[PDB]
Amino acid sequence: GIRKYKPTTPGRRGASVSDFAEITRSTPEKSLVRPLHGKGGRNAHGRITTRHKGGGHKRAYRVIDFRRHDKDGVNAKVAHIEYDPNRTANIALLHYLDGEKRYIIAPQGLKQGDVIESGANADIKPGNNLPLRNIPAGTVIHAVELRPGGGAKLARSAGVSIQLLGKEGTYAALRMPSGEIRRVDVRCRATVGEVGNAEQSNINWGKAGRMRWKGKRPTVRGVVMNPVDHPHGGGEGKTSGGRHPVSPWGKPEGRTRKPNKPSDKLIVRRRRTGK
């Protein structure tokens, strides 16, 4: 759950963490690890592509079976629900009957011992990936794909995931966490159940070291920025810039969504906030 840390030092007074009692193994599988490195917020070209992030704690990579489609009709027990920091959620390894173990996203309330099926015959216990032909309308879903068989991309937020609304014709309607409705094929791949670590939103950061570890760099406010560096720069004292806030990269607040996407016709309306 959530465990709050006692104030031993003035720095870690407010630090509270979601204790990971949901851990079973501590040393990740060495076979599936691929060579990875912190890119430092920089491309191969050497320029800093995005500031406020980079540096920190070098970490490893592991392949997740996001698009599980190659093998079907075989069951798998939950091997060990381990901790992968490269995601907000957790990964629970599976012993499939063919002996080919792949990592998958651990759904909410998953504990070691449940049997998971991936295919048409799969039931409604969480972790079962199956096309929309075999799912009731109205069930909460996660790790949702966009086409019948091109790899799953969406619905992997910890705690709130996409909810299926209804099927009409050959197009299916999906409700977004933002409260929006997206039209998607009735043959895409989607799983059942919410994603775990819902209590992760109750994490309290704590200090700056954790944050350089996590990746982000300290944020430099524009009002003290130099005027050449930023439109908010300059001033003798504290000033807001004398104009509406603007990213120093030229454009102010506003529309950024370029229309006319191939899935733009597959969207009914855009998000509305604070209702």
Q: Which does 6 bind (CB under 5 to 8 A by kind): RNA, Mg ion, none?
A: RNA
Q: Which does 147 bind (CB under 5 to 8 A by kind): RNA, Mg ion, none?
A: RNA
Give the CA distances from residue 199 to residues 17, 171, 196, 203, in Å, rounded to whole numbers and listed in that order. Answer: 10, 34, 8, 7
- What, of Mg ion, RNA, none, does residue 234 touch, CB below 5 to 8 Å by kind? Mg ion
Report the residue number, 124 or 208, with the smaller CB distance to RNA: 208
| Sign of the dihedral through C-alpha 153, 95, 81, 60 | negative
Residue type, 82: E
* Min CB(265)–RNA separation in Å: 5
Nearer to RNA, 134 or 166 (CB): 166
The item of Mg ion, RNA, none sharing an interface with residue 168, based on CB under 5 to 8 Å by kind, is: none
CA dihedral in degrees (80, 83, 84, 88; nearest 10)?
120
Residues lying near Mg ion in the complex (CB under 5 A) are found at 13-14, 34, 36, 52, 61, 99, 176, 178, 180, 219, 221, 224, 234-235, 237, 240, 244, 252-253, 271
- Rounded to 5 degrees, φ, ψ at 133 are -60, -25
- Measured CA distances, 120 to 2, 147, 153, 165 (Å): 38, 16, 20, 20
Query: Judged by CB, which is closer to Mg ion: 113, or 243?
Result: 243
Whole-number Å distance between alpha carbons of 203 and 201: 5
Q: Which does 238 bind (CB under 5 to 8 A by kind): Mg ion, RNA, none?
A: RNA
CB of 195 to Mg ion, least distance (A): 11
- CA angle in degrees (0–180, nearest 5) for 261-266-268: 110
Question: Closest CB to Mg ion among 186 and 267?
Answer: 267
Minimum distance between the CB of residue 134 and Mg ion, rounded to whole angstroms?
27
CB of 177 to Mg ion, least distance (A): 8
List the structure tokens of 274.
């604070």
| C-beta closer to Mg ion: residue 125 or 198 | 198
Nearer to RNA, 119 or 206 (CB): 206
| Count of C-beta atoms within a 10 Å radius of residue 195 | 26
CB of 184 to RNA, least distance (A): 10
Name residues whose C-beta falls within 8 Å of residue 224's C-beta, 6 or more positions apart in sequence: none
Please state the closest distance from residue 134 (CB atom) to RNA, in A: 18
